[PDB]
């Protein structure tokens, strides 16, 4: 897989070991998103509760058809530098405290829009 199964693939890490380069060298290749490297992907700190809020009352939509936070998280954000689609793959992370934009279907969140950063 559901969509909802690949956000959490993707975007969730509870309590993250670290948030800098080399976190986000070590969590894309365990989460299986560097066999072509991926580009550019947000992990979402904190319990899944709070990010599954944003699709109810703890986010407002936000353009056709995605949806803002209401409070900002902990994320890192993961950016692919060198090029080269094949691994090893290399990562330059960017930690904050940010809102963040999602897509939703079904009451829970679906996508990630990396292009609000």
Do not use: W
């Not at 959490?8 to 299986?32: I, N, V």
């Not at 490297?37 to 904190?46: L, M, S």
């Not at 944003?54 to 936000?62: E, F, H, L, R």
Request: with cysteine.
């Amino acid at each position: 897989d559901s969509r909802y199964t690949k956000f959490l693939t993707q975007h969730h890490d509870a309590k993250p070991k670290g948030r800098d380069d080399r976190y986000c060298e070590r969590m894309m290749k365990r989460r299986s998103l560097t066999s072509p490297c991926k580009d550019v992907n947000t992990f979402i700190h904190g319990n899944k509760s709070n990010i599954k809020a944003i699709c109810g009352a703890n986010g407002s939509p936000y353009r056709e058809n995605l949806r803002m936070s209401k409070s900002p998280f902990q994320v890192t954000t993961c950016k692919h530098t060198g090029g080269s689609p094949r691994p090893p793959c290399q990562y330059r992370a960017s930690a904050g405290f940010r809102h963040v934009v999602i897509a939703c279907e079904n009451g829970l969140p679906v996508h990630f829009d990396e292009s609000f950063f």
